[PDB]
Amino acid sequence: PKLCLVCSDEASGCHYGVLTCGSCKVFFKRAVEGQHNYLCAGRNDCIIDKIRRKNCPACRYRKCLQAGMNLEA
Amino acid sequence: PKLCLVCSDEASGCHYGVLTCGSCKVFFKRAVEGQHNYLCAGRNDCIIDKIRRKNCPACRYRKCLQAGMNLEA
DNA sequence: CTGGGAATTTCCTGAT
DNA sequence: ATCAGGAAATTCCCAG
Ligand SMILES: [Zn+2]
Ligand SMILES: [Zn+2]
Ligand SMILES: [Zn+2]
Ligand SMILES: [Zn+2]
């Protein structure tokens, strides 16, 4: 396997239970330790990839959870 | 008793031809000045308000133009 | 070798 | 024209 399950960018390994890129790894860590205030300006279907992942942390965090990312993994 | 024509936040006056808040004023200036290629992660229909205006500069910039904001005014 | 996490840098936004 | 808070992504060091 390769290709991070969140943003489809090249994956650096298995992080918090899921194959992800380095950027999504630290994003999830930040989001989960913080209070995740995030609001989607769209329909919560936003495209998350290398280009657009910065746009919507709401949808990015959702895709992190849906992929099964968790801290104790 | 009047609001920014872009994000609906309290308007500070008439900026670049349109009633806007200070934040949308400097955003627009920076956007035109700034080479920026913006990409919406959504449908280009994004909700732009006080909180969500940070999410999508693409739709924010579009709303600036649609409202009639221009450096010539 | 693996992955967690701190540190660092850069960028965006908004106020002064 | 600064300046500061925040988010983002890389670099680096840690334990295993
Ligand atoms: Zn990713
Ligand atoms: Zn979204
Ligand atoms: Zn505004
Ligand atoms: Zn948008």
XYZ file of C-alpha atoms (C1' of nucleotides) and ligand atoms in Angstrom:
182
model
C 0.000 0.000 0.000
C 0.809 3.706 -0.434
C -1.213 6.860 -1.190
C -2.619 8.337 2.050
C -6.256 7.429 2.680
C -7.197 10.998 3.586
C -5.753 13.399 0.997
C -4.441 10.815 -1.546
C -0.935 12.332 -1.274
C 1.998 9.909 -1.014
C 1.775 8.089 2.323
C 4.771 7.967 4.674
C 3.482 4.999 6.679
C 0.864 3.777 9.143
C -0.092 6.648 11.449
C -2.629 6.356 14.271
C -3.894 3.114 12.745
C -4.212 4.358 9.167
C -1.918 4.746 6.162
C -1.382 8.510 5.821
C 0.980 11.258 4.691
C 3.039 13.137 7.276
C 0.870 16.250 6.996
C -2.374 14.416 7.813
C -0.584 12.703 10.705
C 0.205 15.939 12.532
C -3.112 17.474 11.451
C -5.052 14.694 13.169
C -2.881 14.936 16.281
C -3.536 18.684 16.485
C -7.258 18.354 15.763
C -7.852 15.572 18.273
C -5.896 17.252 21.099
C -7.596 20.543 20.403
C -11.342 21.094 20.526
C -11.842 20.861 16.683
C -13.951 23.949 16.300
C -14.214 23.304 12.550
C -17.133 24.456 10.381
C -17.577 23.453 6.739
C -18.486 26.338 4.430
C -19.801 23.754 1.976
C -22.062 20.696 2.155
C -19.517 18.611 4.143
C -18.640 16.763 0.923
C -15.484 18.842 0.217
C -12.739 17.298 -1.913
C -9.638 16.682 0.191
C -6.361 16.349 -1.692
C -2.850 17.835 -1.749
C -4.214 21.100 -3.172
C -7.484 21.527 -1.272
C -6.832 19.896 2.132
C -5.979 23.270 3.700
C -9.375 24.691 2.718
C -11.608 22.595 4.956
C -10.241 21.101 8.202
C -13.855 20.118 8.954
C -14.056 17.678 6.057
C -10.408 16.672 6.531
C -11.013 15.735 10.168
C -14.150 13.844 9.143
C -12.158 11.826 6.605
C -9.555 11.141 9.303
C -12.219 9.641 11.574
C -14.000 7.785 8.770
C -10.660 6.217 7.834
C -10.382 4.965 11.411
C -7.634 7.206 12.820
C -7.376 7.029 16.619
C -4.764 8.064 19.209
C -4.291 4.804 21.107
C -3.648 2.845 17.902
C -27.361 48.657 11.496
C -25.517 47.767 8.272
C -23.235 44.944 7.173
C -20.362 43.915 4.902
C -21.684 42.953 1.460
C -19.250 40.024 1.409
C -19.147 38.278 4.803
C -22.129 40.032 6.506
C -19.852 41.133 9.377
C -20.147 44.755 10.548
C -19.052 47.072 7.734
C -16.453 49.738 8.521
C -17.188 51.857 5.451
C -17.039 52.002 1.660
C -13.926 50.200 0.426
C -12.929 49.851 -3.231
C -16.463 50.835 -4.231
C -18.361 48.485 -1.925
C -19.517 48.600 1.698
C -17.268 46.074 3.483
C -15.606 45.111 6.754
C -11.925 45.932 7.240
C -10.902 42.284 6.878
C -12.552 41.884 3.472
C -10.971 45.167 2.387
C -7.421 43.976 3.033
C -8.207 40.479 1.737
C -9.318 41.854 -1.627
C -6.308 44.169 -1.870
C -3.980 41.262 -1.084
C -5.781 38.951 -3.527
C -5.561 41.259 -6.552
C -2.009 42.259 -5.608
C -1.020 38.719 -4.816
C -0.748 36.353 -7.833
C -3.226 34.060 -6.077
C -4.666 31.015 -7.784
C -7.555 30.024 -5.544
C -9.305 26.666 -5.677
C -12.634 25.889 -4.032
C -12.841 22.423 -2.470
C -16.595 22.693 -2.941
C -19.001 23.669 -5.713
C -18.011 27.392 -5.728
C -21.230 27.971 -3.748
C -19.507 28.219 -0.322
C -21.143 30.095 2.557
C -19.104 33.198 3.384
C -19.608 34.766 6.807
C -17.552 36.068 9.746
C -16.363 32.564 10.673
C -16.334 30.742 7.320
C -14.721 33.457 5.181
C -11.329 32.024 6.156
C -12.211 28.628 4.676
C -12.527 29.500 1.002
C -10.642 32.515 -0.412
C -11.867 31.356 -3.836
C -15.533 32.012 -3.077
C -14.640 35.012 -0.914
C -12.753 36.613 -3.801
C -15.581 35.783 -6.206
C -18.071 37.486 -3.885
C -15.781 40.527 -3.767
C -15.883 40.761 -7.559
C -19.610 40.022 -7.806
C -20.278 42.806 -5.301
C -18.341 45.157 -7.575
C -15.100 45.612 -5.631
C -12.293 47.068 -7.744
C -9.033 48.972 -7.220
C -10.478 51.559 -9.609
C -13.152 53.471 -7.669
C 13.800 -0.411 10.389
C 9.136 1.586 12.475
C 6.126 5.473 14.163
C 5.111 9.267 17.914
C 5.865 13.949 18.907
C 8.432 18.201 19.756
C 10.444 21.982 17.267
C 10.832 24.903 13.490
C 9.479 27.514 9.624
C 6.163 29.436 6.571
C 1.770 31.232 5.418
C -2.898 33.329 6.221
C -5.646 36.326 8.554
C -6.800 40.372 11.065
C -5.679 44.243 14.003
C -2.806 48.533 14.884
C 4.134 48.981 7.331
C 4.302 46.280 11.391
C 2.864 42.808 14.426
C 0.662 38.559 16.587
C -2.227 34.406 16.790
C -3.237 30.396 14.394
C -2.799 26.630 11.118
C 0.061 23.927 8.205
C 3.962 20.962 6.845
C 8.578 19.865 7.215
C 12.684 18.688 10.032
C 14.503 16.411 13.684
C 14.966 13.327 17.859
C 12.902 9.881 20.669
C 11.651 4.822 21.990
C 10.993 0.219 20.318
Zn -2.816 12.992 3.674
Zn -15.984 20.926 3.809
Zn -16.451 41.238 5.254
Zn -15.775 27.709 -2.046
